[PDB]
Amino acid sequence: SVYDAAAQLTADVKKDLRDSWKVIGSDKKGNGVALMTTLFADNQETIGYFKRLGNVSQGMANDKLRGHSITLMYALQNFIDQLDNPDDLVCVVEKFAVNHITRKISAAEFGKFNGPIKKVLASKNFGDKYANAWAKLVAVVQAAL
Amino acid sequence: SVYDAAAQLTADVKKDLRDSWKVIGSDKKGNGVALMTTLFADNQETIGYFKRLGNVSQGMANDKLRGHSITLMYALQNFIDQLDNPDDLVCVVEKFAVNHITRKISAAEFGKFNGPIKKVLASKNFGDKYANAWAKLVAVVQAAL
Lengths: 145, 145
Ligand code: HEM
Ligand code: HEM
Prior knowledge:
Subcellular location (chains A, B): Cytoplasm
Largest sheet of chain A: none
Keywords (chains A, B): Cytoplasm, Heme, Iron, Metal-binding, Oxygen transport, Transport
Shape of chain A: globular
Oligomer: homodimer
Bound molecules: protoporphyrin IX containing FE
Structural class of chain A: mainly alpha
Domain Globin (chains A, B): 8-145
Number of strands of chain A: 0
Order of helices and strands of chain A: HHHHHHHH
GO cellular component, one term (chains A, B): cytoplasm
CATH superfamily of chain A: Globins
Helix content of chain A: 55-70%
Family (chains A, B): Belongs to the globin family.
Distance between the termini of chain A: 10 Å
Strand content of chain A: under 5%
């Protein structure tokens, strides 16, 4: 149930999500690229999925990777904005899952994003409290896969 | 060239885009669905493209349509935010284009979106000048199709 998953987004969790996003979402180009490069560095087994992006080791200088990273940050923007209404959050999460599902991506695959998110957050001085909050959001996407 | 197209986005055009977006982009759910509904109302032949969404006449009540409409607005948000750096605008546009090219959406068909945009702008008191500004942004995407 994706609804039961969304219900775990309590007042405090939502507050921490916003407070952290106020900072990481301000530099979508930079932090988006950071998230992606960290993903490829900690989980080399995932690179195969982004073959179209060329050499992802170039990072910021890779136009395709940059385009992807910025856009990815807008999916996160989308979720944060829907936190006030669980009904809308679920429909966007599910809309979002469709493309990943067709790519044969599984829930176990998505769980690998918690590491990168946690590391980026820490580089911006956001501790475990925030990493946990973001894991709850990711869990919502997982329940939809 | 997508770059050449981006040149049409002069200072005055960019200003008209931001100003109007501050309004239409502030109610993504409501304005997103209005855009889609208008498209289906004026271009019935496009309904077949969205079979996944189901019965699109259900409007706001169609969760699938709502999720898509809200997400559609974040792509536009992405474009607006990259206006001052064509290098970034270009890579997000090309990235965005990928999925629409696979669906066989031609440049001419993409242009069918100028009608809905013009009408939603009008409904919020933004005239011809703003519509023409938005048609230029659309032209940038058409340059990638
Ligand atoms: C919070 C986690 C994630 C977010 C917010 C996210 C976001 C996005 C967005 C917005 C797109 C572009 C639209 C689309 O085609 O769907 C996308 C594309 C893609 N995603 Fe994800 N994604 C996430 C996790 C993953 C994971 C875990 C994988 C891999 C196992 C994955 C694989 C892909 C691939 C291969 C593409 C297409 C890349 C391209 O060809 O340009 N995503 N993702
Ligand atoms: C300003 C114009 C448009 C924008 C910004 C836009 C935006 C989007 C976005 C963001 C998605 C979902 C995310 C993704 O695919 O990665 C999407 C999906 C799609 N778009 Fe567009 N689009 C536009 C015009 C059109 C037009 C003119 C057509 C065809 C008449 C079209 C056909 C589709 C189709 C078939 C899908 C898949 C829908 C689904 O099954 O969920 N789009 N579009």
